[PDB]
Design an enzyme around this catalytic site. Sequence first.
Site, PDB file in Angstrom:
ATOM      1  N   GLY A 143       0.759  -1.232   0.000  1.00 45.46           N
ATOM      2  CA  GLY A 143       0.000   0.000   0.000  1.00 45.46           C
ATOM      3  C   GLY A 143       0.793   1.286   0.000  1.00 45.46           C
ATOM      4  CB  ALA A 144       0.117   4.581  -1.122  1.00 44.76           C
ATOM      5  CG  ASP A 147      -7.928   9.847  13.020  1.00 43.14           C
ATOM      6  OD1 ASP A 147      -9.022  10.077  12.469  1.00 43.14           O
ATOM      7  OD2 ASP A 147      -6.845   9.848  12.392  1.00 43.14           O
ATOM      8  NE  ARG A 200      -9.926   8.219   8.104  1.00 48.13           N
ATOM      9  CZ  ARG A 200     -10.922   8.716   8.828  1.00 48.13           C
ATOM     10  NH1 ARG A 200     -12.125   8.184   8.732  1.00 48.13           N
ATOM     11  NH2 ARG A 200     -10.722   9.737   9.645  1.00 48.13           N
ATOM     12  CG  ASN A 201      -7.650   5.796  11.110  1.00 47.52           C
ATOM     13  OD1 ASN A 201      -6.995   5.706  10.066  1.00 47.52           O
ATOM     14  ND2 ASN A 201      -8.056   6.959  11.598  1.00 47.52           N
ATOM     15  CD  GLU A 223       5.373   3.081  -2.322  1.00 51.36           C
ATOM     16  OE1 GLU A 223       4.351   2.439  -1.987  1.00 51.36           O
ATOM     17  OE2 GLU A 223       5.518   3.581  -3.457  1.00 51.36           O
ATOM     18  CG  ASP A 227      -3.890   6.122  11.142  1.00 55.31           C
ATOM     19  OD1 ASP A 227      -3.248   5.358  10.392  1.00 55.31           O
ATOM     20  OD2 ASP A 227      -4.128   7.314  10.861  1.00 55.31           O
TER      21      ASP A 227
END
Length: 259
Positions: A21-22, A134, A138-139, A27, A152
């Site tokens: 992934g990015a 947060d 997505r985290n 990277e 995260d």
Amino acid sequence: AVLKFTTEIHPSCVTRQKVIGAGEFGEVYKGMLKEVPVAIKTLKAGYTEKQRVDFLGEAGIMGQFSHHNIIRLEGVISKYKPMMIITEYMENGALDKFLREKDGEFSVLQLVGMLRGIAAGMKYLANMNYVHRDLAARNILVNSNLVCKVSDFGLSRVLGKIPIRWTAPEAISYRKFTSASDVWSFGIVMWEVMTYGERPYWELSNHEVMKAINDGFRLPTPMDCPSAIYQLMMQCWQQERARRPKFADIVSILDKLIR
């Protein structure tokens, strides 16, 4: 809890095998440590000093914790370029993307199990006197065994831009971040899970979300979501923070639905 400093790993102990992934800072690779599989996050060429500080700083915060539902930090390479953060490997990636791919596939029981693990990680974090700030699907990362783990820790701190759609009204309006605002965020994560990765508030702008929140709007029941689970997310969204359940309550409530 006593502050921990970050384990330094020698570069020769780390083998990168493939890009997975990015990242924010550069990277991300899958590879091996020492051997054990790991995720290897690198700091991009031409990094600024602030980027280095934030990159290693987030790792340091993550490294304070030891819990099954919080991403395990193996250590960092900070003495050599490229600099790296080495963590456990999470084959299925971010929870929101994983559920979108597996849309409608899981039983309610399995989704509750996933949420129970996330809540356990947060109960642990709250007991350590940290607020995450947060918390969002997505985290949260998912491993091959379907274990979900909090990741995260950039905004995390002991009790700038914020993730408005995931943030409690008092944190948006008054900068008041507490474990109870993390509970609000957990409610949003519950909605993301039960909708299989729908975007909270769809394509409303941030200003529109803020207005909606201030007007008493709450996200609607996800399709085929049991009433008890929707009510729990609604409880997480009590307007007055003191009236939300604690993470300890959330774990107990979810545990009882595991039947």
